[PDB]
């Protein structure tokens, strides 16, 4: 069983990459923390620091990876403005089909953010992690964009966030 | 140095409206553009803040669904559209501009615009 | 979680003024905010951070307090400082205290 994401224009099957880590903002504002994957610029992303040679939003691509565990950093927690880099232990390939799709494995996806949630529970403490679409943006930044060989790519990543984690 | 916003604002309630901030005196993109509200009497209550580099928002929990922060850098303009209103939704409508600070918390708003009254009723 | 003390303030021109600021569910860092409000007005910067005065605020203005507790002192009180004062961390904003006039 495969996530399906939506891609336009369709990615060759040789731009299947694999997710590295994610950068995520949380929500502003009943014991619950919201996430969605983050619309900031392209210096936001850079900041992370775990970004390879592809250029991508919400999601690093062919990036680096953590040793043993996801490892989450942020300049400030506290601050909902301050993006959340996260950087995965092991990653999540994502297969183009070349036919306007691109596909990820749902259970290893649920792991994956099963993992994150665990990370953001302790270090918000708090009992149910939420992930959620993108709060809008440029068509680069409210999708999943990339740059496969010179072309920019972008995937509807509303599938990969929406989901409840206790 | 200074946030121009657009006129007061009648709405029925169900209805939509939609406020402008435009910027001069400094260069737009290199600040987040927050909104901050205030019903009559009442205290401060803060709405969201848009990325001008992106466009990407992130709202407060409260207004999440009706509420829409844009921009327009060509004309160094912010826009909140509200939509869904309620009586309890009149209130006057700020715009709020961070300062660059050393620690880079950019939650300290020494430049605001002077407000735009939206009145929602029947 | 931002709760402000006292809602109200009665204080004749001259004096000195405490108004005071908790965050509740707060691990404690000196991101605070002091706003002034005026009717009719915008809010008005005073103090950033814990104890740092804005651009040109006077020197009756101070800030300080560590962890949970915050102080905005007014050391000598002029007849424009009489107006709604607000704390801010982050998004968060207190309730307000207003300062009148005693006569």
């Known amino acids: 069983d495969t996530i399906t994401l939506p891609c336009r224009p369709a990615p060759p099957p040789h731009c299947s990459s694999n997710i590295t880590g994610l950068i995520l903002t949380r929500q502003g504002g009943a014991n619950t923390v919201i996430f969605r994957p983050s619309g900031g610029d392209w210096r936001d992303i850079a900041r992370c620091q775990i970004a390879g040679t592809v250029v991508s939003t919400q999601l690093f691509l062919n990036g680096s990876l953590a040793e043993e565990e996801v490892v989450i950093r942020s300049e400030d927690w506290r601050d909902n403005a301050k993006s959340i880099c996260v950087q995965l232990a092991t990653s999540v390939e994502i297969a183009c089909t070349g036919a306007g799709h691109c596909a990820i494995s749902r259970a290893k996806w649920a792991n994956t953010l099963k993992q994150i949630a665990s990370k953001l529970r302790e270090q918000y403490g708090a009992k149910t992690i939420i992930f959620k679409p993108s709060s809008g943006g440029d068509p680069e930044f409210v999708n999943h964009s990339f740059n496969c060989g010179g072309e920019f790519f972008y995937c509807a990543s509303t599938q990969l966030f929406a989901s409840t984690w206790f | 140095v200074q946030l121009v916003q657009s006129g007061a604002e009648v709405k029925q309630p169900g209805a939509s409206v939609k406020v402008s901030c435009k910027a001069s005196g400094y260069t737009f993109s290199d600040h987040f553009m927050h909104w901050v509200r205030q019903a009559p009497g009442q205290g401060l209550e803060w709405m969201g803040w848009?990325?001008?580099?992106?466009?990407?928002?992130n709202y407060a929990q409260k207004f999440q669904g009706r509420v829409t922060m844009t921009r327009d850098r060509s004309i160094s303009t912010a826009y909140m559209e509200l939509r869904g209103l309620r009586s309890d939704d009149t209130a006057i409508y700020y715009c709020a501009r961070p300062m660059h600070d050393y620690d880079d918390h950019d939650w300290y708003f020494d430049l605001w615009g002077r407000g735009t009254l939206v009145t929602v009723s029947s | 979680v931002l709760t402000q003390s006292p809602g109200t303030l009665s204080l004749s021109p001259g004096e000195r003024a405490t108004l005071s600021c908790r965050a509740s569910?707060?691990?404690?860092?000196?991101?605070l905010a002091w706003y002034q409000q005026k009717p009719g007005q915008a809010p008005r910067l005073l103090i950033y951070?814990?104890?740092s005065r804005a651009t040109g605020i006077p020197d009756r203005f101070s800030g300080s307090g560590s962890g949970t507790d915050f102080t905005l002192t007014i050391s000598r009180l002029e007849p424009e400082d009489f107006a709604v004062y607000y704390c801010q961390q982050y998004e968060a904003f207190g309730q307000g205290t207003k300062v009148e006039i005693k006569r």
């Open positions: 951070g814990a104890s």
């Open positions: 569910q707060t691990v404690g860092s000196s991101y």
């Open positions: 848009i990325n001008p580099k992106s466009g990407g928002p």
